[PDB]
């Protein structure tokens, strides 16, 4: 699919930088015709077929196709797409409360954690209902609408690894952040919606304790820990945490994807179900 090739600067004014990554930068922007504000993610294109720099057309088009499908309070909304020779530019809904990652850097109670988790679960329920696996769930990829309220609302972002799972699994060598990836990703096995539920388990552990369950001193150690399900609930962190909360995590951090809680299971779990 081709995108709008008019100069984005003719329709938007950019401002504050909102984020930055390997082949992308995100800038706050304002549409001239409406005065409405957005986030513009500029994604560098591949300059040749066999280069490893920039993002392939295939990966870019997959991400745009998924973003065009989704409309839910807990997932980011895509407004427009532009492109030129160097970049594809996603004009995205503006979310101004920063990353959950940065909010966490400033441990929650179980209520505060479930407040966040319920919204993450609802957003993932929407995605999995459409057979969309996100494949990169982590606190950095959850944004807050406003971080100065008692119960911040959240939106899932960063669908750069997301895939439609129309055959129950995909076999693609998809691979996200070592701390959060499921064993099947570490082992290069076929992947499905189940991998997101493992990631939710890691996120939950972090929300409750401020600690990462599998994190080693090197990437290879972290990956080895993940594959071996090498984690435990340290008493220093979890002594005041309910056994039901631990049960929720335990049923997600399960190596066999078929035995892992599904998104529907997670919403019906006694720790979550009201
Ligand atoms: O960093 C941000 C990143 C993204 C984002 C959203 C969806 C994607 O598929 C993606 O690849 C990136 O959306 C935002 C939306 C915002 O309002 C503010 C932001 O910082 C971001």
From Swiss-Prot:
Active-site residues, record numbering mapped to chain: 136
Tissues with expression: Isoform 2 is expressed in normal intestinal tissue as well as in colorectal carcinomas.
Residues of the signal peptide: none
Record domain Protein kinase: where: 12-272
List of residues binding ATP: 18-26, 41, 93-95, 99, 158
Free-text description of this protein's post-translational modifications in UniProt: Ubiquitinated by the BCR(KLHL20) E3 ubiquitin ligase complex, leading to its degradation by the proteasome.
Entry superkingdom: Eukaryota
Induction comment from the UniProt entry of this chain: Up-regulated following treatment with IFNG/IFN-gamma.
Domain text: The autoinhibitory domain sterically blocks the substrate peptide-binding site by making both hydrophobic and electrostatic contacts with the kinase core.
Purpose: Calcium/calmodulin-dependent serine/threonine kinase involved in multiple cellular signaling pathways that trigger cell survival, apoptosis, and autophagy. Regulates both type I apoptotic and type II autophagic cell deaths signal, depending on the cellular setting. The former is caspase-dependent, while the latter is caspase-independent and is characterized by the accumulation of autophagic vesicles. Phosphorylates PIN1 resulting in inhibition of its catalytic activity, nuclear localization, and cellular function. Phosphorylates TPM1, enhancing stress fiber formation in endothelial cells.
Subunit and partners: Interacts with KLHL20. Interacts (via death domain) with MAPK1 and MAPK3. Interacts with MAP1B (via N-terminus). Interacts with PRKD1 in an oxidative stress-regulated manner. Interacts with PIN1, PDCD6, BECN1, TSC2 and STX1A. Interacts (via kinase domain) with DAPK3 (via kinase domain). Interacts with GRINB. Interacts (via death domain) with UNC5B (via death domain). Interacts with UNC5C (via death domain).
Family: Belongs to the protein kinase superfamily. CAMK Ser/Thr protein kinase family. DAP kinase subfamily.
Protein name: Death-associated protein kinase 1
Classification of source organism: Eukaryota, Metazoa, Chordata, Craniata, Vertebrata
């Amino acid at each position: 699919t081709v995108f709008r090739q008019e100069n984005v600067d003719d329709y938007y004014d950019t401002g504050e930088e909102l984020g930055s990554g390997q082949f992308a930068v995100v800038k706050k922007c304002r549409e001239k015709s409406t005065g409405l504000q957005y986030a513009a993610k500029f994604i560098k294109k591949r300059r040749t077929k066999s280069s490893r720099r920039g993002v392939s057309r295939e990966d870019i088009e997959r991400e745009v196709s998924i973003l065009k499908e989704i409309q839910h309070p807990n997932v980011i909304t895509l407004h427009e797409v532009y492109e030129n020779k160097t970049d594809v530019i996603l004009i995205l809904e503006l979310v101004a409360g920063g990353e959950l990652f940065d909010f966490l850097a400033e441990s929650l109670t179980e209520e505060e954690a479930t407040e966040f988790l319920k919204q993450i679960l609802n957003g993932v329920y929407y995605l999995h209902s459409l057979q969309i696996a996100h494949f990169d769930l982590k606190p950095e990829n959850i944004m807050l609408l406003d971080r100065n309220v008692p119960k911040p609302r959240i939106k899932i972002i960063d669908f750069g690894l997301a895939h439609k799972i129309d055959f129950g699994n995909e076999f693609k060598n998809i691979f996200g952040t070592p701390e959060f990836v499921a064993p099947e990703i570490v082992n290069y096995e076929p992947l499905g919606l189940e991998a997101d539920m493992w990631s939710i388990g890691v996120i939950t552990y972090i929300l409750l304790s401020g600690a990462s369950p599998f994190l080693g001193d090197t990437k290879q150690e972290t990956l080895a820990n993940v594959s071996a399900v090498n984690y435990e609930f340290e008493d220093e962190y979890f002594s005041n945490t309910s056994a039901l909360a631990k049960d929720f995590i335990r049923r997600l951090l399960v190596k066999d994807p078929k035995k892992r809680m599904t998104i529907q299971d997670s919403l019906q779990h006694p720790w979550i179900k009201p």
